[PDB]
Amino acid sequence: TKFVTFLGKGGSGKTTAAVFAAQHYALAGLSTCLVIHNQDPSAEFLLGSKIGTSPTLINDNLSVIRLETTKMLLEPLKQLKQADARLNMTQGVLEGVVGEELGVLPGMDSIFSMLELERLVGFFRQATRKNHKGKPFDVIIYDGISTEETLRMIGLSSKTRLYAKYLRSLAEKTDLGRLTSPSIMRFVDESMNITSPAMWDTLERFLETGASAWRDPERFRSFLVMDPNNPMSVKAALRYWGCTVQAGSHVSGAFAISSSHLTSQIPKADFVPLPFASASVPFTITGLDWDKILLDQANSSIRELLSETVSHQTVMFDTAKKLVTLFMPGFEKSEIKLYQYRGGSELLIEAGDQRRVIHLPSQIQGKVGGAKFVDRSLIVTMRL
Amino acid sequence: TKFVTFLGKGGSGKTTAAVFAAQHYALAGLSTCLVIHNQDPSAEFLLGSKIGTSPTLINDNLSVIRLETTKMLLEPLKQLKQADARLNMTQGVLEGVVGEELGVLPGMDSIFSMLELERLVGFFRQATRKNHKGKPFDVIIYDGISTEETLRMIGLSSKTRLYAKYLRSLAEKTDLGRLTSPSIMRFVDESMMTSPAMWDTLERFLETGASAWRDPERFRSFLVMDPNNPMSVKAALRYWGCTVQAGSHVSGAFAISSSHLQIPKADFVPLPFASASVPFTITGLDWDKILLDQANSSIRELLSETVLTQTVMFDTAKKLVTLFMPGFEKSEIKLYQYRGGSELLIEAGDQRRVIHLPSQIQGKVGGAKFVDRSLIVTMRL
Ligand SMILES: CCCCCCCCCCCCCC(=O)OC[C@H](COP(=O)([O-])O)OC(=O)CCCCCCCCCCCCC
Ligand SMILES: [Mg+2]
Ligand SMILES: [Mg+2]
């Protein structure tokens, strides 16, 4: 199962591009799941149908679902209630929790959205959510809360390690920790399935496996989108390009989405080397004709690109000159801050409100001497 | 301190409206803070200035900050390292945590955004974050992650009280709770009484902030739409309903356009409606022209007047619960009863809202009828 998502400013065509992509992949023979996690009614208009928590099959290959956190939070509570019935740790307090009454709090949308995607795509383990034919989906297209939140998920796998290690330290090297951690570890074990020091090691390995997949381009694919007629939309795309790099990933292409009744202009100059394409999806009052849209010659390019991408570098090291070349589109030198908290072993990059640790090879290891921003790449010279 | 935010679909003029409002309030003499929590460069083009974590003063009354979770997390960690040194709860382990190395994970943007806004507005407690004159801001304008996430923030105070009840139970009615809760309640204290006092005061502090988030003199939300995009207008009606479901209210609706050229004032009755014309050119924006434009007099007046509160109505005679539910269809509104006939749970817009029914109205749902945009629920005894 592969994962596809669209990144861009509000009004840049993300939702339009997500539905277009889902229709294209389904028409092409791929079992496709379009996942919506928001309250924007645009998708329902584009699809010509109301979508809900239960899958809606547009055709035999296009399944659409709306995630609802009110419903998603119920399953974890049910599992926790099952564990407490075996361990009686809460003296029945958990059993009295009416999950059907609980409201959605800040942060819950992002966290539960991330949990459902794991079941659908299978980043950290094999996917468990199957399509209506009992098999796993071929493509998962995700139209999420926001570009910035989607980016927290893309780069999630790499950055969990340090959190888990600090948490293990607080569990195994503190009074209250050695007191609580035992039972908590026993409860999370029961709740998940149907010794403590050892439970922490397996967890760390399970985290490492998730970074191999989320990094694997044969699992995740990101596309930039922009309204070609809005200068702010184009500029935001370039910014989100660098935010994607800073998340630890890459962009697979850039699209100019025109939902108006005009031919889609292409501002292809600023986004090379990315493959560029445009799409014309007019918002007709009588309902979209997807047969016509998908067959329009103007969309032939984007359709090919989409299929070639699912069909199948940010750092370049120079061992001789002691250099780390960091591609940083959408950023200015002033916005990129370099830190070193682990000696010459690693280099931390701070930009776009995200931190990225770049472990340095033996030859490059050292302290930062200077840096220069040429074009859109920062050349960092190391000193030994 | 007052709070202002704009709700609408992507590309509907939210950020444009927020910068317009910030300029208007500062010009009216109010100490204004424009808070941006996202990586969208649009605000900088609109303001004509780079924005960062440190405040940028467009004028003596207009401060602009971009929040950054990487930085927002460091200071709270510092406060937690102090309490650990005193109470010795972690035995120096917390002191070894390198906040400056940690990456932002899913959910942290929302949590830390919510914390910073509390310091700036002071809904639960008195505002802590002061302007450059050492005084609380008069107006906080928030342009956040997304409309949906901002609605989770608007509803927090009304929906935590249930979570807090269950957490107090786990702390006072379980063996692990009775053993650890006392120590944990102390550590929280210093970081910022008796444990039962703490819980009792928390529950008061929670309802104190829910009253502030319901106060029209402290919180104002506005719908924005592009009047030439039907999806933008429909989205505004939907987020109106989501605001009601969050436990709050909308104070007005704005049609933002980049030109002076079919406003849907009638579709948003009884909200005060106004249009706004914010022309822009690549060279930048002429805010003196935009703010003196007579086409923008109405939006400026509506912003200045503010600086439906009742969405649930009870009829003790006919035994009815009338729910203002704009933007929803009868099929998108679910009504559940988990406490017998004493309560009514409304599920809509991926949010739940609990209505405690007056003793007279109490009973079981026996019919619902959508009238205009109000759901009339007949309660059967
Ligand atoms: C200001 C508002 C703050 C809100 C902060 C964000 C809260 C969201 C936390 C939700 C995480 C719940 C745990 C979870 O979903 O894991 C699911 C896990 C996987 O099961 P499976 O399907 O793979 O067999 O199966 C399980 O059931 C794991 C159960 C063990 C972990 C329980 C953690 C409970 C967290 C709830 C916290 C609520 C805070 C208000
Ligand atoms: Mg769109
Ligand atoms: Mg805008």
Numbering used by the authors:
A (entry chain B): 58 to 251, 262 to 379, 385 to 456
B (entry chain A): 58 to 249, 261 to 329, 332 to 377, 383 to 456
Quote from the publication.
In the eukaryotic cytoplasm, Get3 delivers tail-anchored (TA) integral membrane proteins, defined by a single transmembrane helix at their C terminus, to the endoplasmic reticulum. Get3d is conserved across land plants and photosynthetic bacteria and includes a distinctive C-terminal α-crystallin domain. Distinct features of Get3d include an incomplete active site, a “closed” conformation in the apo-state, and a hydrophobic chamber. Both homologs have ATPase activity and are capable of binding TA proteins, supporting a potential role in TA protein targeting.
We generated a construct without the chloroplast transit peptide (Δ1–57) that purified as a single peak via size-exclusion chromatography, consistent with a homodimer. While the sequence suggested missing residues for ATP binding, only crystals grown in the presence of ADP resulted in diffraction. Final crystals, grown by sitting drop in 50 mM sodium cacodylate (pH 5.47), 50 mM lithium sulfate, and 30% PEG-4000, were frozen with the addition of 30% glycerol as a cryoprotectant, and a complete native dataset was collected to 2.0 Å resolution in the space group P 1 21 1. No density for nucleotide was visible in the putative active site; however, there was clear density for an inorganic phosphate and an Mg2+ ion. Like structures of Get3 homologs, AtGet3d is a homodimer with a core nucleotide-binding domain and an α-helical client-binding domain (CBD). A structural alignment suggests that, after NosGet3d, AtGet3d is most similar to the closed conformation of yeast Get3 (45). As opposed to the groove seen in fungal Get3 structures, the CBD of AtGet3d is a chamber. Considering these results, the density, and the properties of the binding site, a phosphatidic acid was built into this density. The aliphatic chains fit the two tubes of density, whereas the phosphate head group forms a salt bridge with R176, R182, and a possible H-bond with Q136. First, in AtGet3d, a salt bridge formed between K107 in the Get3 domain to E404 in the αCD of the opposite monomer is reminiscent of a salt bridge between the homologous yeast Get3 K69 to D74 of Get4.
